[PDB]
A = this chain, B = another copy of it.
Amino acid sequence: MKIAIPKERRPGEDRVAISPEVVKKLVGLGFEVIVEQGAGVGASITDDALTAAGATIASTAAQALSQADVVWKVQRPMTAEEGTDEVALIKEGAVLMCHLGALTNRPVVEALTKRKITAYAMELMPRISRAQSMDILSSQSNLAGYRAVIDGAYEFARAFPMMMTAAGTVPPARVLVFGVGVAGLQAIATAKRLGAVVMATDVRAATKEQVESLGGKFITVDDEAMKTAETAGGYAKEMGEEFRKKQAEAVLKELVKTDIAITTALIPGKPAPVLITEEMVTKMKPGSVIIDLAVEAGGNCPLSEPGKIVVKHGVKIVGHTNVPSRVAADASPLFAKNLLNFLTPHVDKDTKTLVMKLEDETVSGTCVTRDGAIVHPA
């Protein structure tokens, strides 16, 4: 029972799925912990720090995975047609834990299934309170929320905080956060830290109080629909074209005076809802900045383009990809601990085995393939 963690070969992907803290814990469970050379450079994790914590170091990707009974990655492994065939480097019959993508990534799933590899998809983690320590959406989107404000302030040609000065008063920047989940709450907090006046909106009723606790002001649209907007899962549903219009009119009174708009709204299995149309952008002040964190799921603004900064109507619409990788040295230790917390409960220890419960909904709401069978309710 030995575990190995490779470096990320994907363009821009700087997060590693390991840390000194975690390898120390894996050793305790009964793991020989090999790690690919220089795998934590983008995360500012050195090889020497891995060793001291209790990790052997492989000099390549094929050498790390060769005899590894378990493999931890961040993003899905690349397939033959993507370039290098990482799936084949993995010893057959091993277990693989990462953001395998799944649902929207079928090539990778059948290839890992061809080599008996039992893989677990962390994005599908149940929305129950006890799984928050194993939950990669929350750990990563929290940091993306912070990073949105940092990217907004970087692109903006003004200062955030009010400053009374001998040359006159620098006014505070006004920020509007669209969607107040994990990312939106951190964007409010980080914008308020920097001295901005912060406005917020969401379709779920319970958001109102969360915004006020952070000192933001909430834009009630209600439509009576905010009571029945949140689901049993805690995620939003499609609200409708009529509400969208009721929302757009209410939003516009603040949006005209808004300097930074941060949009974070997501709907599971569906395109991202449109919150700021090109018409609404035309009413905005020149020098304004939109940060679209939902860009890889369609976008909350249709003018956003993934991996680019778009300028139209004197407004910068920013749509970076993989925002959590822009905070890679914080993201990675947290990702590796999500995985550790998911895995630890199902280790025998005495005979050094790994019996993944099966009955535990954490386990079954995650296992995409097992010993050559895809086994999932797609």
A contact residues vs B (CB 8 Å cutoff): 14, 21, 41-44, 46, 132-135, 138-139, 142-143, 146-147, 150-151, 153-154, 157-159, 161, 163, 165-168, 170, 190, 193-195, 285-287, 314, 326-330, 333-335, 337-338, 341
Contact A329 B167 (CB under 8 A): no
Could you list some 9 contacts between A and B, CB below 8 A?
A: A132-B166, A132-B167, A147-B159, A157-B329, A157-B330, A159-B327, A168-B333, A168-B337, A193-B193
Interface centre among A150, A166, A287, A335 (most CB of B within 10 A): A166
Interchain CB contact (< 8 A) of A286 among B21, B44, B138, B285: B44
Tell me whether A165 and B329 are in contact in the complex, defined as CB-CB below 8 angstroms, given that A154-B154, A194-B194 are known contacts.
no
Additional A-B contacts beyond A133-B166, A142-B165, A161-B193 (20; CB < 8 A): A42-B157, A43-B157, A44-B286, A44-B287, A46-B286, A135-B166, A138-B165, A142-B163, A147-B159, A150-B150, A150-B153, A151-B154, A153-B153, A158-B327, A165-B334, A167-B335, A168-B337, A170-B333, A194-B194, A287-B329
Q: Which residues of chain B come closer than 8 Å to A286, judged between CB atoms?
A: 41, 44, 46
Check A158 against B330 for contact (C-beta < 8 Å).
yes
Task: State how many copies of this chain the complex holds.
Answer: 2
In the complex, A89 Cα to B22 Cα: how many Å? Answer: 68
CA–CA, A248 to B187, complex, Å? 38
- Which residues from B are CB-within-8-Å of A151? 154
Question: What residues of B have a CB within 8 angstroms of the CB of A314 in the complex?
Answer: 44
How far, in angstroms, from A19 to B285 measured CA to CA in the complex?
A: 16
Q: Which residues of B contact A193 (CB under 8 A)?
A: 161, 193-195
Contact of A285 among B44, B165, B170, B341 (CB under 8 A): B44
- Contact status A159-B337, CB under 8 Å: no
Among residues of B, the one whose C-beta sits closest to the C-beta of A40 is: B286
Asked if residues B341 and A167 are in contact (CB atoms below 8 Å), the reply is yes
Chain B residues, Cβ within 8 Å of A170 = 143, 330, 333-334
Known contacts: A150-B154, A151-B154. The answer to whether A330 contacts B159 by CB under 8 A is yes
User: What's the least CB distance linking A74 to chain B, in Å?
Assistant: 13
CA distance A329 to B259 in the complex (A): 12
What CA separation (Å) do A135 and B329 show in the bound complex? 41
Pick from A44, A138, A142, A338 the residue with the most CB of B within 10 Å: A44
Collect the chain B residues with CB atoms within 8 Å of residue A154's CB: 150-151, 154
Q: A46-B286, A193-B195, A285-B44 are in contact. Are A138 and B157 (CB under 8 A)?
A: no
Contact flag A135-B167 (CB < 8 Å), given A157-B328, A194-B194, A327-B159: yes
Complex contact B44–A157 (CB within 8 A): yes
Would A167 and B133 count as touching, CB distance under 8 A? yes
A334 CB to nearest chain B CB (Å): 4
Q: Is the CB of A329 within 8 A of B158?
A: yes
* Chain B CB within 10 A, most for which of A41, A139, A165, A334: A165
A329: B residues at CB distance < 8 A? 157-158, 287
B285–A157 CB distance below 8 A: no
| Residues of chain B within 8 A of A159, CB atoms compared | 143, 146-147, 327, 330
A211 to B98, CA, bound (A): 45
A37 to chain B minimum Cβ distance, whole angstroms, is 15
Shortest Cβ gap from A322 to chain B (Å): 13
Q: Verify A327–B166 contact, CB threshold 8 A.
A: no
Contacts of A194 in B (CB 8 A): 190, 193-194
